[PDB]
Subunit: 216 residues, 6 copies
């Protein structure tokens, strides 16, 4: 990583933490922020380091490769490189593969990240990676939000737990999520709680809904 | 975090400590100071990092989202943003979502936190988060202070333990807590200890009360 | 903590160490130095942090609260606050609650701790806390020094171990401790060792006493 | 290691991490980036340190020795040393054994790594080491990419996992890997999924192929 | 500790390491260097911290107290304090209790340790502590060097192990140790090895003696 | 240790790592680089610290003492000390015992290690220690290189593993090792592999030999 700005190598505890996260949690949504937390200030070299140390799950890692190549090709199309000798006071403009770390040295990445008018290649590559990771989290989610229904004896709290877990795995736009919250949550409750939630009103908070079905 | 003032990324041990705290202690009151201890000097990005890495408990995390949105709307109402181009020597005034970290970059948060006439967005957001966390601790408390009664064979120490545990989960105003201490504690003791505590006097310390029922 | 003088947040390993100490050792005397060791250079905020993270034992923590309030009231009586506007080059004088961290910000505590003519609020509050902790250690001690008697088959070393353990839990003045050492230790030994220790003389060291009853 | 540029010793956690990696993962491909991650900024002394601390696997370590000697002889052939006394403002040119750390002091390595017009002996030696490590990973791979065939009941995801694992162990040129991906993956699927993948088209992504055989 | 010179608090890992050392190894000789290793650069406050955190073994800790008081009284006798007001540019001369940390603040200890013409109170107190610790190691040693005899089937290596272990616990002067090595080691071997060692000669090394009885 | 140049105490993790290494691996060859890795930049005080903390194995530690005394006497013979008062701008020349840390303070060792025209006493003492450690590794090796023979069903890889393990324990000159490699390895293989290795040619690499007997 680079920290306030000086360069540093990725620590053993960071790398081992990421490896154990992938081992234990597979591709649960909370893996993605963890990743973003273990890669704060990372160069593309550190990100490739974290990705390459994953044993197994090679189908998902290959999908991530293809996503990264898509984003790199899009960056290349939007940022066409100009022909000409690089001036003494300048550094070359990065291609998509340079941002992915495969065609750029560590010194070039540091140069882009520190030089005035900064090109944050680490955060760009990081965004691409998180995009692919979200694709993988969605594809590996074993449930659909439409199938989450409260059991007749299920306490309301557990039903809300499952519901918002699956919803977190859905990863649709926030307006769609608001719609699912305002419709499916009360729609798919069990009769006892469903009646009370209907009696609450269309604009009640989650706190009011959970405290309304607490004794029930 | 930011430390004396320079910026730093949240450490692997900090994040893993928070995750394990949520795993083990659920929503016991002591979780809240622990959180505040693992987030000293945090930017809103670090706080969102700690919140997002929680797997499961998504009902509580959603309630926390709604509380944070309430506090953000209140901040927006009390701090109406002015229309105009931001001057070269200034930074824009933060909205509620900026303080929550969802509409502000890390550089903007650092800018607000370091610039003279400082706006401590991390401590504001931290206060909102602790507010919602207290709501969750209260809602998930399984006992009421009125139901804590000393058993006939229960040593006084254990009764006081349970009593002040539940009282810590009550989270009412301090005057109400003083009233509960001065009334319910002696009122709900077992006959043997209750008589002695009555003989002590209305203004005895907890040390005097516990040493009075020690042999008893 | 503040370290040579710059401010720092309490570390995850420190906090987890304190929590595990309270979990494992309850209120054994060695807990108190450990505490003082894990809080070297602490602001009142760090001390309140360490106290609040304790789950359970809420009777003892409440007793500690009452002791801290006693010491705070005494400080207020001895240091009556003067009425007047605080000058530009000065900081307000701290009340008892300010030293306890409940009515003072972190910046005010740092200000008192660093400014010339220093008011060490952290060490004052720390002294109050250690006072209450000693009260708790004494109240929770399950044995009296007068009941420690050597068994007929008990090796002298174990008897001395128990004796000075209980003595450490007694926490009377040092002259009283010297008296207990000079009287009860030989008085409550078993006949075999008691005779030899009588033959040693009234002014023998603990090394001489233990080596005198080593084979015996 | 050397870090931004000052010198440092290899940490206990780094060394123990490498040792445990070799113990647990043997010579799985993910060992190689891990190595490169635990050796970022290393002098040849640190690299020899990491190699020598490996207990057992001495056949592989000897093969690595022979590879390093090959690369050293090639460097010597391409960089013939000139006869003459080293000038006061200069340092001698490194031989192959100097880069391997066996004939150069730590001070000479630091001198080459820091002096302007830098000779990065640590990264050169590191490249040689990774070359030999790739040889060992290939030789110890127990499967060939041509033998990876999907079972009749095997979910497509697992088949892709095995396939790209073995492919990662193959370590042929990237064009050859592209050919294997475009031919063998669909060629060696089971009939059910093979038909659907044929119906997809010759230019479908891995995401489209896996989502096409998801229910199947 | 104080490190190159600035002051620092004793770390959680250091303290926990010392505690676990006392728990596991009791009073084996290797405890003493470990202590000296965990206390490098320590003020008397850090040393008292390490001593006080020991639970149990209070007989040994009391013996250590008495030894420290002996050394303190000797220091007081050899360094009689002069009567007079301390000058502005000076610090008072330390008594024995000041060196033991019981009558001196942390600031006074730092002052003595850093000021020119330095009084290393931490290393003096450390020497006293190691003296008492050696007394305890000797008293708690369960064997005498004269009783270490090689069994008829005991390999010579194990006999030498036991012998030099007990010898390390003896802690006599080095000339006495040389005598014990030159006499008792060969004297108390079993007949088979004893004859061969007699045939070696009076001035053979331990390597020659062990390789002479290796097959035997 | 001393690090780029300032002095530091040996860390708890370093010391515990060394102790656990000695506990687990006894005197396997890989212990020696580990030692050299845990002692990079060490003063003689740190090295004596690491040696003294070893419990048990006192025969080997005594042999190490005798080796260190041999090297010290040789240094004394080659560097005869001159009689005369040490000048204000100078430090005394070190004897053999000074380099071993037994007759020199930490300040004197730092002085020799930092002063221009440097005497690296830590690396000299370190070389002596590694010499004795190699003696111990050789003496405690339970096998001879001449007895390593491939079993009739033993895969060639395992045979090479054992062979180069024992060879690493032999620690003869590199030319002798080359001879053993070129003769004994093929000489002591089983008939099946031996014939093929004879058919390979006298100058084949270890990679070619192992891949020749891979299927066999
Ligand atoms: Cl790892
Ligand atoms: Cl994995
Ligand atoms: Cl998954
Ligand atoms: Cl890779
Ligand atoms: Cl579900
Ligand atoms: Cl984690
Ligand atoms: Cl959880
Ligand atoms: Cl809960
Ligand atoms: Cl998230
Ligand atoms: Cl209860
Ligand atoms: Cl914790
Ligand atoms: Cl607890
Ligand atoms: Cl207790
Ligand atoms: Cl609290
Ligand atoms: Cl007892
Ligand atoms: Cl290790
Ligand atoms: Cl291994
Ligand atoms: Cl392998
Ligand atoms: Cl080696
Ligand atoms: Cl397979
Ligand atoms: Cl501890
Ligand atoms: Cl203990
Ligand atoms: Cl012992
Ligand atoms: Cl104490
Ligand atoms: Cl023995
Ligand atoms: Cl240790
Ligand atoms: Cl050991
Ligand atoms: Cl061994
Ligand atoms: Cl020693
Ligand atoms: Cl073998």
């Amino acid at each position: 990583p680079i920290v306030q700005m000086v360069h540093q190598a990725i620590s053993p505890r960071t790398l081992n933490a990421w490896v154990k996260v992938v081992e234990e949690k597979a591709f649960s949504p909370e893996v993605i922020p963890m990743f973003s937390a273990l890669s704060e200030g990372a160069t593309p070299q550190d990100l490739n380091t974290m990705l390459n140390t994953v044993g197994g799950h090679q189908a998902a890692m290959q999908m991530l490769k293809e996503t990264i190549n898509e984003e790199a090709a899009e960056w290349d199309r939007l940022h066409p490189v100009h022909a000409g000798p690089i001036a003494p006071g300048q550094m070359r403009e990065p291609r998509g593969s340079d941002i992915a770390g495969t065609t750029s040295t560590l010194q070039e990445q540091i140069g882009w990240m520190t030089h005035n008018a900064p090109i944050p290649v680490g955060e760009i590559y990081k965004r691409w990676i998180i995009l692919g990771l979200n694709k993988i989290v969605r594809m590996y989610s074993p449930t659909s939000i439409l199938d989450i229904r409260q059991g007749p004896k299920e306490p309301f709290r557990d039903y809300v737990d499952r519901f918002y877990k699956t919803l977190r795995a859905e990863q649709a736009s926030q307006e769609v999520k608001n719609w699912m919250t305002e419709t499916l949550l009360v729609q798919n409750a069990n009769p006892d709680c469903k009646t009370i939630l209907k009696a609450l009103g269309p604009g009640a908070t989650l706190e009011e809904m959970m405290t309304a079905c607490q004794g029930v």
